[PDB]
């Protein structure tokens, strides 16, 4: 069937849709289609290109209130600028200086503000199940289900550790810490990366 209304969605509303590039872009919801138990959402992007999308591949073009965001919520967030999908790993608290921690679908982790977040319209029941990379998907499942039990390594600036990159271990140094993230300096390459303190890319977490 062709619908005009479906839950809180209405044909003609402005929305965000996931493109094949895996970045998300503004468009208009031009149709809602049911095929038995299934639903699909036709989006006309602002370049005139059209996609027929599942409801987990559209997001509202507003920032949700704090009380609708949980650990495990499926969101689109500003990725450092593209909009990219992720999972809420932390909500605002004193220890994170009132920010949201996002685990993006590619494994990148970043703190963001409410104004950098958008809610996915029809998330899956197990919100991680549409994470394409299986290693990332399993990590998020474990993290979200185990929460608030979160093993993390306690690290201090100047500390020498081994960090993973491209499947091998590298000599590295902790440059700074920000909440649940650590900025690692790869010593040979002389460049830095922000990494989650519970990541098994930090050899102390792996071992």
Ligand X SMILES: CC(C)(C)NC(=O)[C@@H]1Cc2ccccc2CN1
Residues at the interface with ligand X (CB under 6 A): 165, 170, 186, 189, 191, 193
Q: Which is nearer to ligand X, 146 or 187 (CB)?
A: 187
Q: Which is nearer to ligand X, 45 or 170 (CB)?
A: 170
Paired tokens of 19: 């493109």
Cβ proximity of 103 and 44 under 8 Å: no
Minimal distance in Å, beta carbon 87 to ligand X? 20
Minimal distance in Å, beta carbon 169 to ligand X? 10
Minimal distance in Å, beta carbon 191 to ligand X? 4
Chain centre distance of CA 59:
13
Minimal distance in Å, beta carbon 189 to ligand X? 4
Distance of alpha carbon 177 from alpha carbon 155, whole angstroms: 8
| Block residue for tokens 């993230």 | 181
Q: Measuring CA to CA, which residue among 36, 46, 40 is closest to residue 58?
A: 40
Q: Which is nearer to ligand X, 138 or 189 (CB)?
A: 189
Q: Which is nearer to ligand X, 73 or 163 (CB)?
A: 163
Minimal distance in Å, beta carbon 107 to ligand X? 10
Q: Which is nearer to ligand X, 16 or 195 (CB)?
A: 195
Q: Measuring CA to CA, which residue among 196, 109, 205, 194 is closest to residue 161?
A: 205
Distance of alpha carbon 112 from alpha carbon 86, whole angstroms: 12
């Amino acid at each position: 069937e062709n619908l005009y209304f479906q839950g809180d969605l209405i044909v003609s509303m402005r929305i965000l849709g996931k493109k094949r590039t895996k970045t998300w872009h503004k468009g208009t919801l031009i149709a809602i289609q049911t095929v038995g138990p299934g639903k699909k959402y036709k989006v006309k992007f602002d370049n005139k290109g059209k996609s027929l999308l599942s409801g987990n591949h559209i997001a509202y073009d507003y920032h949700p209130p704090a009380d609708k965001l949980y650990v495990g919520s499926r969101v689109v967030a500003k990725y450092k600028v593209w909009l990219y999908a992720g999972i809420v790993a932390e909500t605002p608290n004193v220890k994170n200086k009132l920010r949201f921690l996002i685990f993006f679908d590619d494994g990148y982790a970043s703190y963001v503000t409410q104004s950098e977040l958008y809610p996915i319209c029809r998330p899956l029941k197990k919100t991680w199940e549409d994470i394409e990379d299986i290693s990332c998907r399993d990590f998020i499942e474990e993290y979200v289900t185990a929460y608030p039990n979160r093993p993390m390594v306690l690290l201090k600036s100047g500390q020498l550790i081994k960090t993973e990159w491209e499947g091998t271990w590298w000599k590295s140094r902790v440059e700074e810490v920000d909440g649940s993230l650590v900025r690692i300096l790869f010593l040979d390459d002389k460049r830095c990366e922000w990494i989650y303190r519970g990541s098994t890319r930090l050899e102390p977490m792996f071992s």
